[PDB]
Design a protein around this ligand. Structure first.
Ligand SMILES: C[S@@+](CC[C@H](N)C(=O)[O-])C[C@H]1O[C@@H](n2cnc3c(N)ncnc32)[C@H](O)[C@@H]1O
Lengths: 160, 8
């Protein structure tokens, strides 16, 4: 097949995984010191689609308004994932408790998933791809990417 | 104090 045929077929497979919301090969588990996390129940290969980071897609101005509201309740956690798409900044706000698993994945600077932007007809989606082979039973982890001194002081696990 | 997640 031509490189272009391979790319089109591959894109269609990812679009179908995003559209269907199929979240196979994973389960919630309690992780020591981290609250809930997600563990692989099957073997993943490097480059395999893992899961969407799914929540409410909003623009940066609306995200800042929601941060002010969430800050009124210290019992509410941190699920806002900021990113650039073309010339604007957006946020996937996954604060609301749903059945989706991407929002339950914990942080590591030396994890096994990499976040990628995948657009479908001009709508951005944040997806997690395996950055290496993942053994069944491993906790899924990615780098949250927050290097702020204030964040690290309040959440020391961001250092590793 | 809240942290964020950022796609760098
Ligand atoms: C997006 S949520 C991930 C799911 C979360 N553990 C839960 O039970 O809802 C982010 C929160 O998970 C916890 N967390 C993530 N990675 C961690 C880590 N490496 N060590 C400790 N806590 C972590 C912190 O409470 C963080 O604010």
């Amino acid at each position: 097949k031509s490189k272009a045929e391979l790319q089109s077929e591959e894109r269609k497979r990812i679009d179908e995984l995003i559209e269907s919301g199929k979240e196979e090969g994973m389960k919630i588990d309690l992780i020591d010191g981290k609250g809930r996390g997600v563990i692989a129940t099957k073997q993943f290969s490097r480059g395999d689609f893992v899961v969407e980071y799914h929540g409410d897609l909003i623009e940066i101005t609306d995200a800042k308004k929601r941060e002010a509201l969430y800050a009124q309740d210290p019992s509410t956690g941190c699920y806002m994932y900021y990113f650039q798409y073309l010339s604007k900044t957006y946020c996937v706000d996954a604060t609301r408790e749903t059945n989706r698993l991407g929002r339950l994945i914990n942080h590591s600077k030396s994890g096994n998933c990499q976040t990628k932007l995948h657009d479908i007809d001009g709508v951005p989606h944040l997806i997690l791809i395996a950055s290496r082979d993942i053994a069944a039973g491993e906790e899924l982890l990615y780098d949250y990417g927050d290097r702020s001194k204030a964040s690290i002081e309040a959440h020391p696990w961001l250092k590793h | 104090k809240r942290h964020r997640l950022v796609l760098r």
